[PDB]
């Protein structure tokens, strides 16, 4: 059951609904799951009141999807008859869930001075008017100048009206004029306010990220897959030639396996990767060419073999690390049963034997080798801030938080307040990111943008107009934070986009979109040469070893990639410009990015045949970038 208990003001969302979720208590632990955290445990822990589990969460108005996790099992709200199949290809989600209609009973038209409804960025002010879906025909912004607003998107419950106005001001005096489909007309509110905004390192905006998995990228030529940090440094010339100026590194801390997501020591670089000196040399070298570096922070859990957890296994209580994790029952691991199956050779095949036996502590899904940290504990939070600052102090420019949506937002809010101003902080959240942005992450891995890109470019399941609507919804939801998002076509956790669309000519059209849209573009190592996934015992992995034999590179994609990276970094409109949809129909789209009088127009023909638009004839599967003094064709 869920009940909207009340409403409170919010400098971010205008107002938020304080909603209560609960269900008959029948287990050891429970979590709230929804699109607000991509259905992950760890972020919203429910506590027992009396006969049932309960939690109070602040949620922006709208229709939300949810469910529960009891003892680690997906369970539906027994009291809620409203169920529905929710699907997000973005993170391979497709199953029945519960619906939560969150909206104030007096709603019709809404706007309150706040971050998402009245902000400024890159010298411009964005104003938003949220209205009951399909009820409002038109709206006018009544400020110093009367200017018509445009309906940019539509939710299940709302229509979104927006307008851009000169931001070289301060205190704005305004109200709105609304026209209903019936013809009713009225003036809404009377506001006096200075636009809000967000803080962020200015260096991030002109970045083009390059994601690297040390183990797969480059094996060092200095003898002392086995890719390492010395190798990355040895390949710096390749990165500067490509033009990327920021790197997102996969975990490099001491870990149990070459995977790296099973940390045993957060203050040292893995031996396998060359050690701390290697990382120190790589860093200063990257600094020479102004290439930023962001590390992967794994704080949702540690390795089962981290000294901390190990101390809990051998001391149980009386272990000063007992509350550093989420122990369900204190005879942590079965009486000798887990240990014997742990010392009886079997060669890691025994991982399945132990798994089947079960364990007495919370973990990342069903991987007993990754016990969840107790984020409620002030000590664990300090430990996280200390790890982060430790590396930040060495010159690291930021962090990408692994499984961020599995950690309470409050933790990230604390980290954000403790972090030096010029550091970039992003998280891995696979669905709506509203509860993770603004005063927490600068941006997150844009999985909702990825989902729209998959539906349109990848699987060609939706039209250009439906695609546009998805983009605009994200714009309304994220507001200014939209420009700080980490955008991608692929990464270490999904299939290479080239393998999804097959056609190298289609990949190019998607790349054109990625490199010219709002948000920070990024490439997964190898994408610049057309690197495809590899077969690993019947399972295709996108983590294919980087290829250095240039006769194996696709020179067209490399050339095209270099061109887009160069065009992006040097085009003010693509960097700071607003987004104006010019024409989205079927498989064709054309839009404009505008900044201080400059404009860059982008047309993408994602169809098999030539299309006549913009007075020209745009070739099949190709993009066209038009700006001051140049009309550039982009096609394989």
TrEMBL record:
<dbReference type="InterPro" id="IPR014756">
    <property type="entry name" value="Ig_E-set"/>
</dbReference>
<dbReference type="InterPro" id="IPR032640">
    <property type="entry name" value="AMPK1_CBM"/>
</dbReference>
<keyword id="KW-0326">Glycosidase</keyword>
<dbReference type="InterPro" id="IPR017853">
    <property type="entry name" value="GH"/>
</dbReference>
<keyword id="KW-0378">Hydrolase</keyword>
<dbReference type="InterPro" id="IPR013780">
    <property type="entry name" value="Glyco_hydro_b"/>
</dbReference>
<protein>
    <submittedName>
        <fullName>Neopullulanase (Alpha-amylase II)</fullName>
    </submittedName>
</protein>
<dbReference type="GO" id="GO:0004553">
    <property type="term" value="F:hydrolase activity, hydrolyzing O-glycosyl compounds"/>
</dbReference>
<dbReference type="InterPro" id="IPR013783">
    <property type="entry name" value="Ig-like_fold"/>
</dbReference>
<dbReference type="Pfam" id="PF16561">
    <property type="entry name" value="AMPK1_CBM"/>
</dbReference>
<dbReference type="InterPro" id="IPR006047">
    <property type="entry name" value="GH13_cat_dom"/>
</dbReference>
<dbReference type="GO" id="GO:0005975">
    <property type="term" value="P:carbohydrate metabolic process"/>
</dbReference>
<dbReference type="Pfam" id="PF00128">
    <property type="entry name" value="Alpha-amylase"/>
</dbReference>
<dbReference type="InterPro" id="IPR004185">
    <property type="entry name" value="Glyco_hydro_13_lg-like_dom"/>
</dbReference>
<feature type="domain" description="Glycosyl hydrolase family 13 catalytic">
    <location>
        <begin position="211"/>
        <end position="568"/>
    </location>
</feature>
<dbReference type="Pfam" id="PF02903">
    <property type="entry name" value="Alpha-amylase_N"/>
</dbReference>
